[PDB]
Structure 1
């Protein structure tokens, strides 16, 4: 078995290998990359997402989200308070202000220490989940707006034609902006490209050990656990690396820098934070190996998790028994 310790692997494809996306994901899995739950892909040196980022300040963040924490430093939840719209130029300026800017630090490890120590005492603002793309239409390789769709994958694998569409999302981050512990909708893959700015630190649990994280979470967030059998679908809970280590939960960490791709694999729980002002683009995708994960994916029926139009068909075809109760949660 390849990569039996479930280490995060880093790949350096050549320009020739960067042509066929599906084939390169399949190659990474042949080398056991999926066991970690997360892989890094450094693009060939000849590749570019677009010519420059000089012209992005007029993108609108219609609903910036202030991420307010409750709990203790290593075990907290966050809720998102809606703020007034602002442009990417206005957001960048806010991120760089004395109130919100990254503090002086030695290195990524020092900054990671400061994050886990101090996150709860601040409420950074996140421009998350903005439909759109920063890939130039002429970028032919690893263009996240031109991938094969999850609906066409399900159709190719299972023969059923379904409604729905699959498009990317932009995330504009600042120091301490945080993504809570989660897997993707229907335990899909995700791919994330860091277009510009400061780094993003990731934590990940190997898919084979996901249930260990869930059990810990039920112990640490006992009210939430009673409220919903899949409350991590709410995407609000954080647990620090120190707390994971104290409870024997297997995990790994890695920092993504501008120009790098990250791939999360089916049922790979992940969480993390941004180091300063940045812009990432991400999208869900599928492969034939996903289908079995989609059939077994947990679902939130309590009404909190509330997701996209396109998840309907996935639940309806892959999880017909669950569909009724889940749709009651959606309405």
Structure 2
């Protein structure tokens, strides 16, 4: 009546053989899990990585969260150690319910969270150590440096050690060297009761893998990729403030919204309580949100497989339509992988080859189009050398790589080939096509992938 819990998302309990290879396992579950957006994976009972960080020596400054439904919050933002944060978090939850922490039922915390965010008259604020870079704070998983124990060493090379997943051969980012805003490095989340993550999808519609190392559960809500635009239409009607365009990547607006509201508008929503030692996997373009039941410690990483690759291209097209900034150039990634065709995994090579064929035919059509507009002059340009802010389309903000148009009248400015008319006031003969590759350069790059693929 007040809150109706969404149905449970799928839970998988792989055997050790199934678990050994995460890419194979994630591909196998895709038919089921992509219908729910999120799923939970319980590792085999003996897979128990030991936790390595320290409670007194690592510091962080958490974000302050006002728990108000539909209120705009920025997606990324007093000093605490893990010890002092834990003391604050435990006292908060204990005092809130006047109970011991392990006695507060998860169902009650969930009901209370949704009551609390709905009520104007409540002004409950909490703190969340969110989006902490593993660079500075260190990973919860073992990494090669401190002398590691034999127990720690068993997990250095695990496929489910989140440090390794981005650099394994079946990762399409394995041979990519640009630093990509942390898409290959894990991020940490130090939670307390009611600290929350707003509704969002991942950069470039990537997967995410999320591991709860220890503490009280993390409650999730998830929506399948197929329903993403449904959800966005519901949210735009109820909170249009969130859909006004932002000046950069760091100004993304997000919010808390009751999943019953989505369910009332026929958006499918699934839930789970993720406990210590369990993974949650989010699928491409799968909206998710949630909150922590109490003091806890989680680690997550973006993840990009051969299954994701075609969706990556659709994402950048969607970003262009919305005038939203890219984290990296998808075409640049594809061309980097083509330049390493000889060392790619053969299934990766085959998949890149297919995406490259689409890229080449689209580029051919765009170049024919701008030529018909009277852009005659051209010059090769190594787009990859330019900082991102020097190669964004004036109009749609896409990061250019394959080609762009420049104008001697407006020095430094570029547009992508969809927006030739938006660059400058001057006639078309004053423009120049700047291109990374000739069409004749591209066909052999694609053939190398084909040879590798066999």
TM (normalized to structure 1)?
A: 0.81
Please say if 1:136 is aligned against 2:151. Answer: no
Please say if 1:199 is aligned against 2:198. Answer: no
Please say if 1:169 is aligned against 2:187. Answer: yes
Residues 171, 147 of structure 1: alpha-carbon distance in 2 compared, 3 angstrom cutoff: same
For each residue in 1:150-185, what CA deviation from the matched residue of structure 2 results, as whole angstroms up to 9, or x when unmatched?
9984468xxx85523611111100011010100100
For each residue in 1:84-142, what CA deviation from the matched residue of structure 2 results, as whole angstroms up to 9, or x when unmatched?
32211111111112478663576322221100111462111011111221112421331
* Equivalent-residue separation in structure 1 for 2:132 and 2:113 (angstroms): 25
2:328 to 276, 297, 312: 312
* Equivalent-residue separation in structure 2 for 1:125 and 1:69 (angstroms): 10
Residues 37, 45 of structure 1: alpha-carbon distance in 2 compared, 3 angstrom cutoff: same
For the residue of structure 1 that corresponds to 2:91, the secondary structure is coil
CA contact (8 A) 1:151 1:162 kept: no
1:125 is aligned to 127
Residues 300, 109 of structure 1: alpha-carbon distance in 2 compared, 3 angstrom cutoff: farther
Residues 181, 169 of structure 1: alpha-carbon distance in 2 compared, 3 angstrom cutoff: same
For each residue in 1:281-326, what CA deviation from the matched residue of structure 2 results, as whole angstroms up to 9, or x when unmatched?
00001111101221122439999x988xxx2244755799995243
1:3 is aligned to none
Residues 255, 98 of structure 1: alpha-carbon distance in 2 compared, 3 angstrom cutoff: closer
* Equivalent-residue separation in structure 1 for 2:25 and 2:295 (angstroms): 30
Q: How does 1:178-327 map to 2 (within 5 A)?
A: 178-227=196-245, 234-297=252-315, 298-299=318-319, 311-314=327-330, 323-324=392-393, 325-326=396-397
CA contact (8 A) 1:64 1:125 kept: yes
Residues 115, 20 of structure 1: alpha-carbon distance in 2 compared, 3 angstrom cutoff: same
Residues 153, 114 of structure 1: alpha-carbon distance in 2 compared, 3 angstrom cutoff: same
1:64 to 62, 65, 69: 62
CA contact (8 A) 1:95 1:276 kept: yes
1:246 CA displacement: 2.5
1:42 is aligned to 42
> Quick check: which one's strand share is greater?
1
For the residue of structure 1 that corresponds to 2:112, the secondary structure is helix
2:164 is aligned to 146
Q: Which shows bigger deviation, 194-203 or 89-98?
A: 89-98
* Equivalent-residue separation in structure 2 for 1:216 and 1:230 (angstroms): 24
1:186 CA displacement: 0.5
For each residue in 1:210-244, what CA deviation from the matched residue of structure 2 results, as whole angstroms up to 9, or x when unmatched?
1100101111112332445999x825212102222
For the residue of structure 1 that corresponds to 2:273, the secondary structure is strand
For the residue of structure 2 that corresponds to 1:202, the secondary structure is strand
Structure 1 segments unaligned to the other structure (5+ residues): 1-5
For the residue of structure 2 that corresponds to 1:13, the secondary structure is coil
The alignment yields a C-alpha RMSD, in angstroms, of 3.6
For each residue in 1:51-103, what CA deviation from the matched residue of structure 2 results, as whole angstroms up to 9, or x when unmatched?
x56x6203534331111245xx4x33335897x32211111111112478663
Q: Does 1 or 2 have the higher relative contact order (CA < 8 Å, sep 6+)?
A: 1
> Quick check: which one's helix share is greater?
2
TM (normalized to structure 2)?
A: 0.60
Number of residues of Structure 1 aligned to a counterpart in Structure 2:
309
For the residue of structure 2 that corresponds to 1:8, the secondary structure is coil
2:72 is aligned to 77
CA contact (8 A) 2:242 2:253 kept: no
CA contact (8 A) 1:42 1:259 kept: yes
